[PDB]
């Protein structure tokens, strides 16, 4: 409650974060998936010093990730179950990626990033994040990052759907929608509606498999190619979900112009931009901007900056509806 | 509440930890000690890019360390105030030390440490922690470490003084009591009592000054030298606080035997060992053993281990009294 208690608790939680990271990297949650195991057993299964493994496992029990069991054994607790790779709603991705040595070093160079103007990660690894992860030697970190993004989408799904009336529209078009995670959530919450997925040839296979797992193959048209090419026409709702952070103004205007030409003169049609808006985000949103500062070159925009771009594309802002403590839906009208 | 919410929150509090580190390293709290400043001013004062400093400062505001103030300015919130070096109840030490690159890298190597058996810090560094800190090139981290230890002592002070009856002793002997922090606390709780501070010459001057600032100079005898020589005789309470943690068995026994013959045969004289006891600590304590695993080679002892050690020195455990959720007072009696 007091400031002193809050500072001391941040120090403690920092340690728990490392504890959870190590438990996940040793695949201890997966080894425990079918029931309890002894320290000696888990030692042989991980190649660890039994005495120091026990101390790590015990810390994990202290943080309520595992529970201690008779005959010097340990067993999964609810929080530890979520750190299994196989769990349908796993959160192993975010627990491991952000505590990885290469990633953690970047958050360490936060001071020099503020002083220089260069993203900390690029300052640290002499290369942008997406190029770093593209290397074969960093595949394990890449998969964890990929999982983290899926998990953030899962965590914040309800925040969007309960903060804007998507039920007004019947034909959605997600530009840069990836595997179609967001499109799936909207089409599930809005019956009898159809969708269009627009993205590059990278996630094409991932989209078809994920949509099939949701039985939405019939309701979603997957379009693969450049944005300015396969952009669909005749949709009453267009969605840009965090894909303008890494665009120049000149490039974003052309995209927004192309979108304007696609939705026609339909007065009920809308462009929906999903993003964190500077000055109109919550306290949590201000903290999360740290991620952008450390990892990438992109940047969130203010309302005034959004109005500038949209006006040059023939758009006006109807409102910026809050969607939880971080994100918001920027509702845009034509003309 | 849910396991999912707790996991996401550890991810967030991790980012906050880094924010507070960078804020403290830039001495922003100290720069704001006398009132609000604009971003531009703080940019020139720190040699920072204004654009990215503002985002960092805004994040610190989100985490309730600073406050945003009209005309692009910031000032101290209560939590940020405690991150000033000059604050009487400062907590800058613990907030900076555990996020230093050399220290953070150790908590990252927690997996290899568990796998190898070597303390994590000594895997990435050629020297143990204290040898490392002793070097002049690491004075900045050395000073944050010492502050951290003072802060933890202040944070857990009441937990000891309310969990054990120190008031039934009249002469205290703090073996390895540093500058006299603990001894000072006890003497304030027992108005009619004196003390003997036993420690090396490393902190002789530090101890004299602190005791003078507490007006305890006439109530505490400060004995400087090797433990096995300057042990006072006739004390009815002997205190060992965080000493035998890194002493070997053969070495610890000798020290315990020397204490044993200094107590005489007074039936009420006690040896009080303050420590975390494996198997008899709270969930927090199980987590904090991580620090021992990462930083140093020493280890906490179980009750049976303490029994066996004290047995060879002619002591009996009267009881192990819980002092909060981490520490305990081991009350020992001469057989």
């Amino acid at each position: 409650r007091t400031a002193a208690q809050r500072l001391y608790q941040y120090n403690v939680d920092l340690k728990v974060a490392f504890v959870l990271y190590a438990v996940a990297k040793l695949h201890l949650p997966d080894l425990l998936a079918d029931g309890p195991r002894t320290t000696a057993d888990l030692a042989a299964a991980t190649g660890s010093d039994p005495s120091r493994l026990r101390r790590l496992l015990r810390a994990a029990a202290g943080a309520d990730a595992l529970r201690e069991v008779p005959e010097d054994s340990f067993e999964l607790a609810p929080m530890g179950d979520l750190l299994r790779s196989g769990h349908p709603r796993s959160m192993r991705g975010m627990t491991t990626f952000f505590a990885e040595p290469d990633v953690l070093a970047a958050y360490g160079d936060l001071v020099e990033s503020v002083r220089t103007g260069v993203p900390a990660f690029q300052l640290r690894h002499r290369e942008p994040l997406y190029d770093f992860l593209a290397r074969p030697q960093h595949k394990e970190v890449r998969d964890e990052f990929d999982a983290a993004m899926v998990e953030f989408g899962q965590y914040f799904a309800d925040d969007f759907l309960t903060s804007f009336d998507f039920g007004r529209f019947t034909r959605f078009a997600d530009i840069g929608g990836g595997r179609g995670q967001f499109l799936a959530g909207v089409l599930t919450a809005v019956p009898s509606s159809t969708g269009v997925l627009v993205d590059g040839p990278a996630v094409a296979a991932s989209a078809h498999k994920f949509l099939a797992s949701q039985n939405l193959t019939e309701r979603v048209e997957v379009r693969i190619g450049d944005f300015f090419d396969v952009l669909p026409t005749g949709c009453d709702a267009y969605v840009l979900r965090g894909v303008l952070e890494d665009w120049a103004d000149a490039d974003a205007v052309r995209l927004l112009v192309r979108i304007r030409q696609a939705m026609g003169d339909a007065p009920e049609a809308r462009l929906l931009i999903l993003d964190s808006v500077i000055g109109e985000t919550g306290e949590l949103g201000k903290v999360l901007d740290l991620d952008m500062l450390v990892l990438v070159e992109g940047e969130h925009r203010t309302r005034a900056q959004w109005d500038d771009l949209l006006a040059r594309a023939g758009f006006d802002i109807v409102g910026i509806h809050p969607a939880g403590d971080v994100w918001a839906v920027i509702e845009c009208r034509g003309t």
Side-chain angles (χ1 to χ4, degrees), chain A:
Chain A
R1 255 299 304 168
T2 201
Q5 290 166 341
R6 290 191 49 185
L7 278 178
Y8 179 79
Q9 194 61 53
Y10 282 123
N11 187 257
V12 168
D13 291 355
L14 179 53
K15 308 177 194 307
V16 171
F18 283 108
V19 163
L20 300 180
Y21 167 82
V23 168
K25 296 298 293 190
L26 286 161
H27 290 102
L28 291 163
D30 307 281
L31 290 158
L32 292 175
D34 296 339
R37 303 263 220 86
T38 75
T39 297
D41 191 350
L42 295 173
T46 63
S48 303
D49 167 39
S51 182
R52 287 188 157 245
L53 179 67
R54 181 179 301 106
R55 295 169 58 180
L56 180 65
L57 293 170
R58 198 184 289 130
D64 299 329
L66 309 180
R67 65 173 71 99
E68 302 190 58
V69 154
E71 77 173 332
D72 191 32
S73 304
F74 294 82
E75 166 181 313
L76 282 181
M79 210 177 64
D81 189 42
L82 295 184
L83 297 180
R84 290 189 301 107
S85 328
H87 195 295
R89 295 161 279 106
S90 165
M91 296 175 77
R92 189 192 186 268
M94 74 175 65
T95 306
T96 54
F97 176 78
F98 290 88
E100 207 74 69
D102 289 338
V103 170
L104 212 64
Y107 285 76
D109 283 340
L110 176 53
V111 172
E112 191 60 21
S113 176
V114 167
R115 286 174 171 165
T116 304
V118 174
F121 193 95
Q122 301 183 16
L123 191 57
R124 185 57 173 190
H125 304 280
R126 317 136 52 244
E127 204 185 28
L129 174 63
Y130 303 117
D131 287 348
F132 174 86
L133 298 171
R135 308 168 96 88
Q137 43 176 312
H138 300 304
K139 177 187 177 297
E140 200 178 56
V141 183
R142 175 171 72 252
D143 294 343
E144 290 174 348
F145 178 77
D146 289 337
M149 301 300 101
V150 172
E151 295 157 12
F152 290 137
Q154 289 178 321
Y155 190 86
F156 286 111
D158 289 327
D159 277 336
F160 287 111
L161 301 179
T162 64
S163 292
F164 186 77
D165 189 13
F166 288 97
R168 280 192 285 148
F169 313 101
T170 56
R171 207 171 197 271
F172 301 84
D174 199 341
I175 292 87
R179 50 207 284 274
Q181 184 171 336
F182 174 80
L183 181 55
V186 176
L187 293 189
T188 306
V190 188
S192 300
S193 62
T194 61
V196 182
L197 204 172
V198 177
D199 212 315
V203 296
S206 184
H208 288 133
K209 185 179 287 292
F210 169 74
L211 292 174
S213 77
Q214 306 294 292
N215 283 288
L216 290 170
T217 310
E218 196 69 26
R219 291 170 58 192
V220 180
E221 179 188 359
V222 180
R223 298 195 176 191
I224 301 303
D226 187 271
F227 282 162
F228 297 96
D229 290 82
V230 295
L231 196 62
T233 64
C235 305
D236 43 22
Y238 288 79
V239 173
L240 286 171
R241 46 165 308 185
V243 287
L244 290 186
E245 288 87 300
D246 212 272
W247 284 54
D249 280 21
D251 298 332
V253 163
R254 299 202 328 274
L255 178 65
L256 289 178
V257 159
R258 284 286 296 185
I259 293 188
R260 179 62 181 97
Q261 300 182 350
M263 46 199 303
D265 309 331
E268 69 280 352
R270 295 294 195 274
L271 162 61
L272 313 180
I273 299 173
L274 283 62
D275 202 19
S276 191
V277 183
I278 299 297
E280 298 173 54
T281 189
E283 304 312 286
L284 178 56
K286 302 173 181 171
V287 174
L288 288 191
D289 193 41
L290 175 63
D291 287 330
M292 304 275 299
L293 201 62
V294 175
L295 295 187
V296 294
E297 188 190 348
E299 196 179 355
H300 295 124
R301 290 180 170 87
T302 63
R303 189 186 196 106
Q305 291 171 325
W306 275 114
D307 240 314
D308 176 271
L309 291 182
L310 290 170
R312 293 197 297 180
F315 282 113
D316 279 329
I317 295 182
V318 178
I320 304 186
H321 318 271
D325 298 338
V326 179
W327 311 110
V329 174
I330 310 183
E331 180 183 352
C332 307
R333 174 205 307 263
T335 309

